[PDB]
Structure formats: structure tokens, C-alpha cells
Ligand binder design. Structure first.
Ligand SMILES: *[C@@H]1O[C@H](CO)[C@@H](O[C@@H]2O[C@H](CO)[C@@H](O[C@@H]3O[C@H](CO)[C@@H](O)[C@H](O)[C@@H]3O)[C@H](O)[C@H]2NC(C)=O)[C@H](O)[C@H]1NC(C)=O
Ligand SMILES: CC(C)CCC[C@@H](C)[C@H]1CC[C@H]2[C@@H]3[C@H](O)C=C4C[C@@H](O)CC[C@]4(C)[C@H]3CC[C@]12C
Ligand SMILES: CCCCCCCC/C=C/CCCCCCCC(=O)OC[C@@H](O)COP(=O)(O)O
Ligand SMILES: [Ca+2]
Ligand SMILES: [Ca+2]
Ligand SMILES: [Zn+2]
Length: 778
């Protein structure tokens, strides 16, 4: 019978054009039939059976049933067997390893149930089985990490879609809870019907990837009035559908503990209550799965999207204290700041004046302004038209707003800060057939889970920003095996081919062991030369006229010499490299804005004789004088420091060209600044990979087991306006700037189209785990 919801409640073939709908999203579209809340959302007698309800006569108006025939109809309360058939709650069963998916007949695959909780800070898991018995046993039985790193901004909507796509917000388009698309000339918001339009959403989410490859998904979404218990009973009821109508992947999301976390903060005593109610819902799901004889078949992912931080209104910075006029600008306020012009036609609006008026203007300033290209590359922002040119990175525990008027304490917790902040770290737990038994894994970013979930359903994942294989150690059996990217350009090994008289670069001068993990593979068409020296090895690009990488090893005992005062302006030609593909000092001395540095520092030479190799023209790179304060401190103080703390370090350094701020290696046509009157391109960033042995008892060049690595992508900027303390000695701000721009080896690989750690004696999945490690310093 058409026109009403009986026989169709939460049907997985929902559609507005035909009839009124009865699915779990009819509320959000305001299109439910008149009998939806009467038939599909029954709430009589609650969600728990009792001793007296055992074997009752079927009353169809009850919320859930405790009759005898409910197991066949597939709509018992989740505690039916526990209270009526003497069974035990799943949380009380001992932890028994699942060596193989024990599934009842009919299941092509272990079902995947995604359980998402908003605002579940990683600190919450320290409450134990006293508050959350079901969650802690999922964590101890299955696979878990100390925390999971979200994406920036650490907000629900960008993170929930990132979890479903594996892409950064810059690529899937959901760059914030609120955003303005200038092409649409429209505003995206949390509340409202604008979010329902498909134009805002890029990438390919998990449910679309499953649908396209013949794996039914159903409906991932739940209208907010549908209670959590009804959402669980709906999922369990779907699990009893016939074979070719039963979805394989399911998703539950909960708005707690985000709501209570905002009202009371992450450490409020009121936080205990919602975390009990969340574990109750987890208990209902696992009780129902055991009741369905699926507790040893289903895969369950308990995941969060963002943490929570203590934020009060008394800690809100106001732009009206900084800018002469705030009426000409529109600001996205809160734990992050995005500033654009309020008027289409306003030529009196200039970003350089606003950025300057916001740059180190007050002591104890709790925000920092950035052009989006100058944000730390680990954030992977910028590359989207919905991302404004002016971004304010807000200090943790603080807010920023335009005026005090747009501000009228209502809240005690908030989120959205840098994704490396401790309070923003969230949780991940994997329990089920394919997940490992009682295993802890290192922290990882949520961009990597999309590959795992498709692997759990046999789906080929759409292109994403996870490094497929870096999470292979999460599963019991992996169908996917990573492929080392094959080398595109083979290197040249040039000997001495020229005489020093062949060179007229206008340059003066008054006169294995260093490649520990194999050479980097060049993954694009170019021409470069391998150059061996006593102290360092480098792959010199003949196209960019500078090395793409330079590798050298500093022992724990290595001494730091100094350039003699008569050799400080010494640059020598490389007789192995043609003068046609060499840099020249006349370019640098005629460029009044640019100086030069060295990828291998002459301060770390093993001998004055070998020091002349450091002054080769093939070891030099264009560097602004203000950046040379940062580069020279890193090479002369910090590398020796790192080699002392870590029993030697292997340093791989090189330039990065990303003028279009898309995170990918630029080709020749995208470089927008050269050395004046030259063909020497100006790098936008400089990277370094500092590798040691995880077992510090062994030196870096004699390491047997896993490695310890840390990387940075220092922005090559002509001023130090980013560091407000740059007036003082380099021991008071440089290390802080580098900690801000920490990076994964993976991010350097994207920005240079290179591949590191190819001959390591470790398994490639373990290496893929290393290349995704982010040293957060927190
Ligand atoms: C994160 O992953 C996404 C998706 O893999 C990456 O974005 C993709 O970037 C590539 C390279 O720029 C784009 O490919 C190109 O497509 C154009 C047509 O638009 C055409 O010239 C070629 O087919 C070329 O391959 C691709 O369209 C784009 N896709 C999406 C969905 O964004 C992104 O670069 C990754 N981020 C990082 C930091 O690696
Ligand atoms: C409970 C409501 C208030 C929350 C609104 C839910 C909203 C986030 C969901 C509901 C419908 C979803 C879209 C739909 O599933 C189809 C796809 C196709 C895919 O290629 C891109 C994403 C998209 C458009 C979904 C986006 C998220 C939606 C709007
Ligand atoms: C497949 C992995 C994802 C698991 C399934 C989640 C659904 C897929 C994600 C879709 C992107 C849009 C989110 C869906 C609705 C979000 C429901 C929700 O809970 O929103 C609450 C959020 O406003 C409040 O948090 P904040 O304002 O950021 O503090
Ligand atoms: Ca680029
Ligand atoms: Ca300064
Ligand atoms: Zn949330």
C-alpha cells in the first residue's frame, strides 16, 4: 500500500520523488509520512527487557520486543537473551581471540559497523571500565592507539568527511563547519538546508565507493531526533534482512560528548554522565551483535573526530583591538580565524595592511596571522577557494572574534585548533574478525582509515591522501600489499669532465657511509647527477641547478669547526658538472635581496681539506639573509645537538618548490621567482629528514632494528615576522619556528616527488609507517 510508512520503516530505498519517505533522513528533509513517528519510532516500555516482560505476548506498539518470536522478526531488545534466556552481557565474556570470522551462513563478508562519537577527547579513555566497561574491553580486546590525530581544522564536519574520504579538507571541499564559496556566492552552515546540496562535497565517500562497486551500504545518516537506541535497533534489524538486501557497511554517529563537552569543558565533573550513556549504547550494539551470533564476525570501528579544550569567553581576542576598521571585513570566528572582504567591490581592502596590523602587535598575543600558503605544510590547508587568504592560527584555550558586539558565559569547551595540540587528539578502536587481538598500534592520522575500511570490504579505494600500507599492522590479514614507486629518472654518476678554467661563474675562493637508507628515487622526468664527497652525498638536479637532496651523517662525537675568515666567501666550481648547469655568484651579488647557503654545512667538515667540498657551487642554494639566521642555527647548533641526543643522526636536506600551495612538486612553469637575472629558481621551503636508530644504544650508521625519524619543512621567507622573538638570539626562537613546521617524510615526498627509505632492511609497510610518523613535540 502506497502513501504511508507501514511495512517501510527505515527502508533503505529512500527517494523524495516517489511518495513520502520513511527512512532515517525524512526528518532532515521534512518529508516523513503522517504515521512515521507512530509506526517507525515506537518508544513504548523503553529499550530494556525485564524478568516480567520475559515471554510476553507480542504487542506491536512496544519500542522493542521481548516475545519468543522476536528473534525471527529481528526486533528484540538488545538485552533479551541476557534477561530472559540467561545469557551474559558481551562485556562480561572473557576476551577470546578471533582467529577466523565465525559468521552464520549467508554472510559474504564480515560486516563493518562504524561507531563515531563527536568530541571524544583521547583523555576520556583514561576513565577505564568503571565509567565505560564496554568501550574499555573493545580497546583491550581489539586494536587501539594512544590517540588518533584529526585534520585541521579539528571540527566535526571536516573530520567526519575526511574519515569517509581519506582526503584533507582542501581536497574534499568541507574546509569548515562554516565556509563561503565565492563561485557559488553562497554560505555553507552546520544548521540549514544548504549543507544538503551535493555541490559542496568533493571526493568519493565510503558509502559511494561501496555502492559503485556493488557493495550495498544503506544509509549512514540519522535524523537528529531518532534516538540512539532506535539507531542501534535499526542497524541490528538491517542485519537480519535477506542476503542480497542486507548492507555490508553501517555507520552510527553520536553527538555526545561534544554537547556536554562544550557546556562544561573536557575536565568537568558532568562529563562522566554522557560517557556512561555512550558506553550504554555501545553495550546495546555489542549485546545485539552477540544476540545475533555476529559478535565474532562483525568488524567494529569506534572512532572520534576531534578532542575538546578548555575555552571561556574571557579568553577571546578581538580584532577591533588591532584593526582600524572591522566593518569592511567578514571573519569566521572561534578557535580559528578566516578573514575576507565583506564587500565585492572594495578596492580599499588590502590583505597586506591587515596581516601587518595583526603581526606581533601586542605582547601575550594569542593568535598568529598567516597567508594560507605560509601555514605549516603539515596542515595541508590553503589549496581551496573556500579557504580565505588570511588565516589566524589561534592559540589553544583561546577564541578570536571581530567585535565584542558579535560576542553577546555560555560555553566552557571548544575545539578547532592546530591538529597537533594534545587536547585535540581523538580516539580509535578496532575490534573484530580482521582486527588484531590485544594489540596497540602507534598514533596515526584519520586520513589513513578510509583505505583500511575499503580493505575491510574488498573495495578499491578512490584516490585519497592516506598512505595505503601504513596501517597494515592494524589487521590480522591484509589483502592489500604496498608497491614501492618505481624510479622514473635514472641518475648520472659523473666523474671529472672539465677543468677549472672552463668555468666563469664570477665566484671567488682563496685556497655507504653517508647514504644510510639507499638513494632517493626521482619519480618524475628530469636529469640529475649523483655526487660523492668525503662528508656528504647529493643528487644534483641539472634542471633546477641545485641538489634535490643531500645526505650526510653526523656522529655523536663529531666536532663543529668553523669557516676560516679568508674562506667565508669561497665558492668553487664543480669540475664534474657542466658550466651550462651550474650556478654563478654574479647572480647572487647582483640580487640585493638574496644571499646563499649550503645544503651541507661547512661547519661540520671532518677536515679542512674536505671542507673545500662544502664550498662547491653544487652544494649552494639561494637563501634570504633572514632565513639564513634559521638555516645556520639548525646546521651549526641543532644538528650537532640532535647527533648528541640520538647517538648520531643522518640528515637529508633539500629544497621544495610549491608556489601554487597544493602540496605537490612544482614543475618548471610554476616557479614565480628566480634569482634576479638568473635561471636559478627560488625554493619556497627547505626540508630536512633527520633519521637515527630507535634503539639509541646503537649508532645511526650501525642500526639493526627500527628507525627514529623527524622532519621539518621550513618556509623560505625573506623576513622573520612569523617569530615575534626574532629580535633576540637564535637560541630563543629558531627551534620554536622549526617545531611549528614539523612534517612527515610523506609530506616531503609529495612536495619533492622523491622516495626515501628504499634500502632499509625493514619491511615496506613498516617503512610506510615511518614515513607517515609526525613528530608533534607534544
Ligand atoms: C590528496 O589526494 C587527492 C586525490 O588523489 C589529490 O588531488 C588530486 O590531485 C591530482 C594531481 O594534481 C589531480 O590530478 C590531475 O587531474 C587533472 C584533471 O583535473 C588532470 O590534469 C590529470 O588527470 C591529473 O592527474 C586530481 O584531479 C586531484 N583529485 C582530487 C580529488 O583532488 C591531492 O593532490 C592529494 N594531496 C596531497 C597533498 O598529496
Ligand atoms: C541529520 C542531518 C541534519 C545531517 C545532514 C546529513 C548530510 C551531512 C548528509 C545527508 C545526505 C548526504 C549526501 C548523499 O549521501 C550523497 C553524496 C554523494 C557523494 O558523491 C558526495 C557526498 C554526498 C553529496 C553526501 C554528502 C553528505 C550528506 C549531505
Ligand atoms: C565513514 C566514516 C564517517 C562515519 C559516518 C559519519 C557520517 C559521514 C560524514 C558526513 C559528513 C557530515 C557529518 C554528518 C552529520 C554530523 C552529525 C554530527 O554529529 O554533527 C555534530 C556537529 O555539527 C557538532 O560538532 P561541532 O559543532 O564541530 O562541535
Ligand atoms: Ca605544487
Ligand atoms: Ca620578529
Ligand atoms: Zn562532533
Amino acid at each position: 500500500i502506497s502513501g504511508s510508512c507501514k511495512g517501510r520503516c527505515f527502508e533503505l530505498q529512500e527517494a523524495g520523488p516517489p511518495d513520502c519517505r520513511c527512512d532515517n533522513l525524512c526528518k532532515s528533509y521534512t518529508s516523513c509520512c503522517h504515521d512515521f513517528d507512530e509506526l517507525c519510532l515506537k518508544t513504548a516500555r523503553g529499550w530494556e527487557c525485564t524478568k516480567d516482560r520475559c515471554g510476553e505476548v507480542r504487542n506491536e506498539e512496544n519500542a522493542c520486543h521481548c516475545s519468543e518470536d522476536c528473534l525471527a522478526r529481528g526486533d528484540c531488545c538488545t538485552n533479551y537473551q541476557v534477561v530472559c534466556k540467561g545469557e551474559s552481557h558481551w562485556v562480561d565474556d572473557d576476551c577470546e581471540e578471533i582467529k577466523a570470522a565465525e559468521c552464520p551462513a549467508g554472510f559474504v563478508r564480515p560486516p563493518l559497523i562504524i561507531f563515531s562519537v563527536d568530541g571524544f577527547r583521547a583523555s576520556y579513555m583514561k576513565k577505564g571500565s568503571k565509567v565505560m566497561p564496554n568501550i574499555e574491553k573493545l580497546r583491550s580486546c581489539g586494536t587501539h592507539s594512544p590517540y588518533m590525530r584529526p585534520v585541521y581544522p579539528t571540527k566535526t564536519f571536516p573530520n567526519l568527511y575526511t574519515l569517509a574520504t581519506g582526503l584533507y579538507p582542501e581536497s574534499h571541499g568541507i574546509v569548515g563547519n562554516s565556509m563561503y564559496d565565492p563561485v557559488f556566492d553562497a554560505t555553507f552552515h552546520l544548521r540549514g538546508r544548504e549543507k544538503f546540496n551535493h555541490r559542496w562535497w568533493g571526493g568519493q565517500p565510503l558509502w559511494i565507493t561501496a555502492t559503485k562497486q556493488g557493495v550495498k551500504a544503506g544509509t549512514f545518516f540519522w535524523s537528529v531526533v531518532i534516538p540512539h537506541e532506535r539507531r542501534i535497533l535499526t542497524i541490528l534489524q538491517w542485519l537480519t534482512l535477506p542476503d542480497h538486501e542486507r548492507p555490508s557497511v553501517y555507520a552510527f554517529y553520536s553527538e555526545q560528548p561534544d554537547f556536554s563537552g562544550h557546556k562544561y569543558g573536557p575536565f568537568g565533573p558532568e562529563m562522566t554522565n554522557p560517557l556512561r550513556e555512550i558506553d550504554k549504547i555501545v553495550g546495546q550494539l555489542m549485546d545485539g551483535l552477540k544476540q545475533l551470533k555476529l559478535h565474532r564476525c562483525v568488524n567494529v570501528i569506534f572512532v572520534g573526530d576531534h578532542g575538546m579544550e578548555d575555552v571561556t569567553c574571557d579568553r577571546t581576542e578581538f580584532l577591533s583591538n588591532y584593526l582600524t576598521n572591522v566593518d569592511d571585513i567578514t571573519l569566521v570566528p572561534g578557535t580559528l580565524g578566516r578573514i575576507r572582504s565583506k564587500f565585492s567591490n572594495n578596492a580599499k581592502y588590502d590583505p597586506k595592511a591587515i596581516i601587518a596590523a595583526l603581526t606581533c602587535k601586542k605582547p601575550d598575543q594569542h593568535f598568529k596571522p598567516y597567508l594560507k600558503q605560509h601555514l605549516p605544510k603539515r596542515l595541508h590547508y590553503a589549496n581551496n577557494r573556500r579557504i580565505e587568504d588570511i588565516h589566524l592560527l589561534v592559540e589553544r584555550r583561546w577564541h578570536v572574534a571581530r567585535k565584542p558586539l558579535d560576542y553577546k558565559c555560555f560555553f566552557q569547551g571548544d575545539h578547532g585548533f592546530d591538529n597537533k595540540v594534545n587536547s585535540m587528539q581523538t580516539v580509535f578502536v578496532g575490534y573484530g574478525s580482521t582486527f588484531k587481538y590485544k594489540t596497540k598500534v602507534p598514533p596515526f592520522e584519520n586520513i589513513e582509515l578510509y583505505n583500511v575500511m575499503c580493505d575491510l570490504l574488498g573495495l578499491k579505494p578512490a584516490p585519497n591522501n592516506g598512505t595505503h600500507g601504513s596501517l597494515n599492522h592494524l589487521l590480522r590479514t591484509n589483502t592489500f600489499r604496498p608497491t614501492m614507486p618505481e624510479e622514473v629518472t635514472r641518475p648520472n654518476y659523473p666523474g671529472i669532465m672539465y677543468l677549472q678554467s672552463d668555468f666563469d661563474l664570477g665566484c671567488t675562493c682563496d685556497d655507504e657511509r653517508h647514504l644510510l637508507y639507499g638513494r632517493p628515487a626521482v619519480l618524475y622526468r628530469t636529469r640529475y647527477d649523483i655526487l660523492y664527497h668525503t662528508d656528504f652525498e647529493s643528487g644534483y638536479s641539472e634542471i633546477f641547478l641545485m641538489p634535490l637532496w643531500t645526505s650526510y651523517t653526523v656522529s655523536k662525537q663529531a666536532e663543529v669547526s668553523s669557516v676560516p675568515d679568508h674562506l667565508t666567501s669561497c665558492v668553487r666550481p664543480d669540475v664534474r658538472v657542466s658550466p651550462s648547469f651550474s650556478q654563478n655568484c654574479l647572480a647572487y651579488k647582483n640580487d640585493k635581496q638574496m644571499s646563499y647557503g649550503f645544503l651541507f654545512p661547512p661547519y661540520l667538515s671532518s677536515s679542512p681539506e674536505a671542507k673545500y667540498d662544502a664550498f662547491l657551487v653544487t652544494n649552494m642554494v639561494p637563501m634570504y639573509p633572514a632565513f639564513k639566521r634559521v638555516w645556520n642555527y639548525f646546521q651549526r647548533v641543532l644538528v650537532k645537538k640532535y647527533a648528541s641526543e640520538r647517538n648520531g643522526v643522518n640528515v637529508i636536506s633539500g629544497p621544495i618548490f610549491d608556489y601554487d600551495y597544493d602540496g605537490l612538486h612544482d614543475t618548471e612553469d610554476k616557479i614565480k621567482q628566480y634569482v634576479e637575472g638568473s635561471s636559478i629558481p627560488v625554493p619556497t621551503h627547505y626540508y630536512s629528514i633527520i633519521t637515527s636508530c630507535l634503539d639509541f644504544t646503537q649508532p645511526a650508521d650501525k642500526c639493526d632494528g627500527p628507525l627514529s625519524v623527524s622532519s621539518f619543512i621550513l618556509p623560505h621567507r625573506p623576513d622573520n615576522e612569523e617569530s615575534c622573538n626574532s629580535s633576540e638570539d637564535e637560541s630563543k626562537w629558531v627551534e620554536e619556528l622549526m617545531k611549528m613546521h614539523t612534517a612527515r617524510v610523506r609530506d616531503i615526498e609529495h612536495l619533492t616527488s622523491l622516495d626515501f627509505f628504499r634500502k632499509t632492511s625493514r619491511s615496506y609497510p613498516e617503512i610506510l609507517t615511518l614515513k607517515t610518523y609526525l613528530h608533534t613535540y607534544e
